[PDB]
Every structure is written in structure tokens, then in C-alpha cells.
Amino acid sequence: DDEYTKLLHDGIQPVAAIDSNFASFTYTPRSLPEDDTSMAILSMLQDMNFINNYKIDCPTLARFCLMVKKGYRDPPYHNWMHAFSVSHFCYLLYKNLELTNYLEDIEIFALFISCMCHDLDHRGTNNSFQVASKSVLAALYSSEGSVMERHHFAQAIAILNTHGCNIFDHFSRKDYQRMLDLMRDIILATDLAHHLRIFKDLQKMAEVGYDRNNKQHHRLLLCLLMTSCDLSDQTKGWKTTRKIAELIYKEFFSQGDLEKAMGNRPMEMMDREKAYIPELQISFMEHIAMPIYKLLQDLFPKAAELYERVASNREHWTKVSHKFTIRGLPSNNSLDFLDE
Amino acid sequence: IQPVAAIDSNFASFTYTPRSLPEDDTSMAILSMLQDMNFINNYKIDCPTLARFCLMVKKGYRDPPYHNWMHAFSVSHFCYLLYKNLELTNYLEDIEIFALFISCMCHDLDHRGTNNSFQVASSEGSVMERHHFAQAIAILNTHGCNIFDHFSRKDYQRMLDLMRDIILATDLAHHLRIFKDLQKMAEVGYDRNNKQHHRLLLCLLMTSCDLSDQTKGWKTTRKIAELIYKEFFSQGDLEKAMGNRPMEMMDREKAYIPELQISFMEHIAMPIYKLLQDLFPKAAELYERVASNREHWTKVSHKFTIRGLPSNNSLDFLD
Numbered sequence A: 001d002d003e004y005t006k007l008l009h010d011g012i013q014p015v016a017a018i019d020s021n022f023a024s025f026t027y028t029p030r031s032l033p034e035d036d037t038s039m040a041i042l043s044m045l046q047d048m049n050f051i052n053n054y055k056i057d058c059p060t061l062a063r064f065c066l067m068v069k070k071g072y073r074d075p076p077y078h079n080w081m082h083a084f085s086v087s088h089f090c091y092l093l094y095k096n097l098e099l100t101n102y103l104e105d106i107e108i109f110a111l112f113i114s115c116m117c118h119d120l121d122h123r124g125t126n127n128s129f130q131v132a133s134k135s136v137l138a139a140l141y142s143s144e145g146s147v148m149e150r151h152h153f154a155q156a157i158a159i160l161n162t163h164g165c166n167i168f169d170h171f172s173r174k175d176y177q178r179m180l181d182l183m184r185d186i187i188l189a190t191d192l193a194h195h196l197r198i199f200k201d202l203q204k205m206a207e208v209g210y211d212r213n214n215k216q217h218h219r220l221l222l223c224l225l226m227t228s229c230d231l232s233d234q235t236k237g238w239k240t241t242r243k244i245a246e247l248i249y250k251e252f253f254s255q256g257d258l259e260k261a262m263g264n265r266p267m268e269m270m271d272r273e274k275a276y277i278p279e280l281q282i283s284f285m286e287h288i289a290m291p292i293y294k295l296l297q298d299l300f301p302k303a304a305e306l307y308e309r310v311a312s313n314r315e316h317w318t319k320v321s322h323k324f325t326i327r328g329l330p331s332n333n334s335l336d337f338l339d340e
Numbered sequence B: 001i002q003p004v005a006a007i008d009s010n011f012a013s014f015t016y017t018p019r020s021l022p023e024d025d026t027s028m029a030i031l032s033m034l035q036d037m038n039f040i041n042n043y044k045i046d047c048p049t050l051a052r053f054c055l056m057v058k059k060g061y062r063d064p065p066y067h068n069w070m071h072a073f074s075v076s077h078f079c080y081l082l083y084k085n086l087e088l089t090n091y092l093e094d095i096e097i098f099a100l101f102i103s104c105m106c107h108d109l110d111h112r113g114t115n116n117s118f119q120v121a122s123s124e125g126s127v128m129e130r131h132h133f134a135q136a137i138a139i140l141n142t143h144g145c146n147i148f149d150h151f152s153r154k155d156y157q158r159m160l161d162l163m164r165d166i167i168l169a170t171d172l173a174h175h176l177r178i179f180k181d182l183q184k185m186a187e188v189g190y191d192r193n194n195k196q197h198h199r200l201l202l203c204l205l206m207t208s209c210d211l212s213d214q215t216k217g218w219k220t221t222r223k224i225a226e227l228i229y230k231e232f233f234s235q236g237d238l239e240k241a242m243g244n245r246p247m248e249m250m251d252r253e254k255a256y257i258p259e260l261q262i263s264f265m266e267h268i269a270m271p272i273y274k275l276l277q278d279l280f281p282k283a284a285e286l287y288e289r290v291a292s293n294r295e296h297w298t299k300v301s302h303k304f305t306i307r308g309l310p311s312n313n314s315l316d317f318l319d
């Protein structure tokens, strides 16, 4: 309502007016103030021509975007600024890798909307913690798997069914179902478990080459692209990867604290007393992040700089590892911690 | 003068931690120990003079983190424990044991929280130890403070010579020089008729007093390390500001505590208490407690790696 008037009266702006480096892989979406993000979303959709392509009612689109933004909570990492930055990287893939030569317009459109919606109502805890804590989400989704991802999707649907927020209510019956299916598949691809299951399929597709006439390749690419966006904080500079590490480990240790308080022993990366950040970071870089961008590189030669930045950032984590060794007294001037 | 048992039932025991005794009761405790060893009656020490001397000594210490009155007091208390537990009268003359106790009180007088190397950056070594002794002489030459003012000319000079020697023995370099001679003495067995054996033993006893914090439990050794590193790094900070490269162990950004604690424990502290055990079977529990503390230090060495986020929540220190 208040933010609605602000957003609407701003008007859909050319992507250049935001920043000259906006469509570049070097640009950091987190540099943009949060109060400008909703306009940037609209700008990106305009630049990809999805507004005119699908004749989306602009006030409906404004309301949708504000609702999505409002649909995020404020944990250290999984907040709107994460969804925004993920969305931005999806836009970057479109502009830089020329996705129109690989996927249907409806698929790219679904990828971008999914990115906006992919962590809706995230509470800063993983799928595991929902079960352990016996949350409502576990009650709802634990037997199906990908607990959080199913909630994110359910939240996205609820937004669409909010009056004045249905950006697809003018879509053909065929296109409408397609969009819903695509959003579900893409959002569920954000579960690491899913990525790990389809990993060998992705390796096959990258080696043999992407075949645009292969409907399975479309599915797999959409998944790979979604995971690339989700992890894109690893493709920027040192400052970004380091700041993000702060937010992610903050979130992780908060969850770990809650697991100790209810009896459970949290995994190493959730435990603030046992977690060695350099080691956990490097292991994640080398074994999760880097292969995703290696696969992307093999499918799109223009993605090579992304893999190189993740590799460079991983080397930087090795370089600064030694600093986690307490020299002198701790920044406390006490040794009381030697009796834990 | 309060009897020793009235201070604490465990006051004469090796398990007693003299740092647990309130600083306001320490002067009084000094007089009690001297009373219990019977040096007051033995040497006809004037009590008011002794009272004033003790307060001048107490006042003669500055307030660095480690080298303050409480260090001197705890050192002096350990000398009393050696007397009470090992029966030093089998090895040493009464005047030598008396000199040792007074030397313990005086051995770090006017310490500034800096080492001999700080004085370098007058070059025959042991600069601070020499200063500590001069300060002891200056206190004795203070009106109403000379506890030996009634001694014979021979006994006076004897007492001063002993104090100088014992105080000079607190320098690590001195200890390392005489170490072979200490080992030989322990090897052949103590000879009471051997003047050189008396001199060497006094040096050993003093160093064992000086390092006595390592002979208690974990709490003491951990707390003392804090105080010592606090002191060492403040000197490092000062040397950096004045425009000099401090030694690695004085630099809070270079120094690794576990590697330094253990090296000190096993290479310096433990061989001293081993030699003490060799000469005094009853000192066996002391070496064991040092070895145990040395073992505990290796146990907690892993904690000097940052797990989770640092004190705050920022990885700002990485950039």
C-alpha cells in the first residue's frame, strides 16, 4: 500500500539507469540498497521482455514483487537480499550465456520467478532441523522430502492466489499449468539432495553437449542453472564470499545452538565449538560449488570466468586459513577458555 | 604475630596456593613464616624493624601483571614450604636458609614488566637481577628498616653476599651456566662439608621458588600464563612503538602460546624440579605436578584454533 505507491510511481526503468555494470558478472547485486531491489526486479523482467511477451499487468506485477519481498523473513543469510541476488544472477545468465538459444521463453521466465520465490519464508534452518524440531513444515512435508523447498513452493502458490497478485491469471490454461509445474521442479532443484541425485545426469549432458530438442536436457539445465544462481555468492570477489560466509555460518551456528538445547548433537558445520570454517568452506567450494560451475563451463564456454572466480576464492580461503590460529592472547586477554 | 595454623590448616603444605591468601594478609603471613622457622629468635630480629622492612619490600614492587608483590610473596611462601617439607637444615646453615627467604622477598624488586633484553635494546648479563639486589640494599639502608643492623661485621657481609648470589641465581642465564655443576652434585650426592655444594643448592632452591607456580594445579599454571603473556606482549607493544622489532615470544601477533608454554615447561621448569627430586626424595610430588601441568597444556593446545566465529560475529580479521 505505502510501498506500492512508491514502487508503482517509480516506473519500470532501463537496466542502465540502475548501474552501467548491471548486466556484468563482476557486478555485486548486494551493493544495491534494499529499497531499490523491487524496482530492479521489474527492470530485469522488462529487459528480458517478459512483461510485453506475456502481457503481464504491471500493477499486478508490482504487487506480486512486493508480496514476494514481504514473504521473506530476516535470518542472517536466507532473507530477501539472497533471493534478490539469486534473481539477479539468473538475469546475468540470460544476458551473458544467451539462454534464449537453449530454453523456451516460458522456461526462462519460470526460472526467474522461481529464483525470486525459491527461499520464501525461510527460517534460517535446514531440512534436517524441521524434522528434529517437529515443526509444522515437517508435519506437512517430511514424508515427501525436501521439506523447506516444498514450503517455498507452497508459499509462492499462496502469493499467486492472493487477490491482485496473480501474474499468470491471463495466461492460457496450457501455459498456466506449465508455469506451475516449472516453478515446482525448479524450486525443488534447490535442495542439495536433489542436485546430488541428478549429478551424474548433469555430467552426462555436459559431456555429450546440450541438445535443444531433448526435453530431459531442458529439465536438467533448468536444475543446474537454478543451483548456479543459488550459490552465485561464490562467483564474485573476496569481499562477497567472505561476508556471505559470515551470514551463513551465523545462521548455521544459531541452528546448532537450538539443536544442543533440545538434546541433539548438531553436525560439525552447525557446531560453533567444533566448526573449523577454513576447512568447511574449502570442502564446500571444491566438492559442491566448483563442480556446479565446472558443469556450467562445459555447457557454456562464456561461463568459464565463473568457475575461475570460485576456484580463486577457494585458493583465497587456503591463503587466509592460518589466521584462525590464535596468536598471543585472544581478543579478550583471558585464558579462561582453556577449561572450556 | 599469628601462628601459621591460624592462617590456614594447609598453609605448610605443597598443595597450598599462597595466591588464595588476600593481599592484605600477606605482610602478616611473612612474619608468621619467619616466626615458624624461628629466625626472629635465632637472629634476635627486632620485630618493629622487621614489620617496617616487610612493608618497604611490599611497597618496592610495582604493579605489572606478573612481577608484583604477589609473585614475591608466593615465591617466599614456597621457600617456607621447602624448609617445612624437605628439612633443609640437613643441607644448609641457618644463615643460608634465612638469606634464601629474605632473597625470595626481594628477588624481583622494582620490576617494570620488562626483561633484561629490554635494558640492552652493565653488559655482563643479569641487569635486572643486579638492579633487584641494589634495591634490597637501598631498603636496608633506609632508616628503621635494616633487619641486620645488629649483626656482626662478618655476619652482615656474609648475609649481603648470600643475598646477591641467590638473587643473581634468578637469571636464567646463570641457571644454564651452573646446570652441569648442579647435575654433577646431584649425581655424586650432596656433601655438607663442600662449600660449593651449599652455593649450588641455594641457586637451585631459589629457581625452584621462582618457578613454584608450575608446581600447583591447573588453575594456577593457567592463571600465571595469562599474567606472564600479558606482561610479555605489553613489552612487545612498547618495543614496537619505540621503533624496534620485539622478540617473537614478545610479539602478540607472532607468539604461539602452546609452543611457548610447553617449551618452557619441559626444557626449563621440569629439569629444575627433576634435580630437586634427585636431591630431595620428598620433592617428588612437585616434579609430578609440573609434569601433569605440562601434560594438561598439551591437552588444551587445540583450543588455540578458532572454532566458529570469533569473539563477535565478524570475519573482519581475515581482510
Ligand SMILES: CC[C@@H](NC(=O)c1cnn2cc(C)cnc12)c1ccc(OC(F)(F)F)cc1
Pocket (backbone or CB within 6 Å): A189, A190, A191, A192, A193, A195, A226, A227, A228, A230, A231, A245, A248, A269, A280, A281, A284, A288, A289
Ligand atoms: C545454506 C545452503 C546453501 N549453502 C551455501 O550457499 C553455502 C555457501 N558457503 N557454504 C559453506 C558451507 C559449509 C555450506 N553451505 C554453504 C546451499 C543452497 C543450495 C544447495 O544446493 C545446491 F548446491 F545444489 F545449490 C547447497 C547449498
Ligand SMILES: CC[C@@H](NC(=O)c1cnn2cc(C)cnc12)c1ccc(OC(F)(F)F)cc1
Pocket (backbone or CB within 6 Å): B169, B170, B171, B172, B175, B206, B207, B208, B210, B211, B224, B225, B228, B260, B261, B264, B268
Ligand atoms: C618471567 C620469567 C620467569 N618465567 C616464568 O616464571 C614463566 C612461567 N611461564 N612462562 C612461560 C614462558 C614462555 C616464559 N617464562 C615463563 C623466569 C624466572 C626465572 C627463570 O630462571 C630460572 F629458570 F632459573 F628460574 C626463568 C624464568
Ligand SMILES: [Mg+2]
Pocket (backbone or CB within 6 Å): A118, A119, A148, A190
Ligand atoms: Mg533454499
Ligand SMILES: [Mg+2]
Pocket (backbone or CB within 6 Å): A206, A207, A208, A209
Ligand atoms: Mg564433450
Ligand SMILES: [Mg+2]
Pocket (backbone or CB within 6 Å): B107, B108, B170, B171
Ligand atoms: Mg626475576
Ligand SMILES: [Zn+2]
Pocket (backbone or CB within 6 Å): A082, A086, A118, A119, A190, A230
Ligand atoms: Zn537459496
Ligand SMILES: [Zn+2]
Pocket (backbone or CB within 6 Å): B071, B075, B107, B108, B170, B210
Ligand atoms: Zn621472580
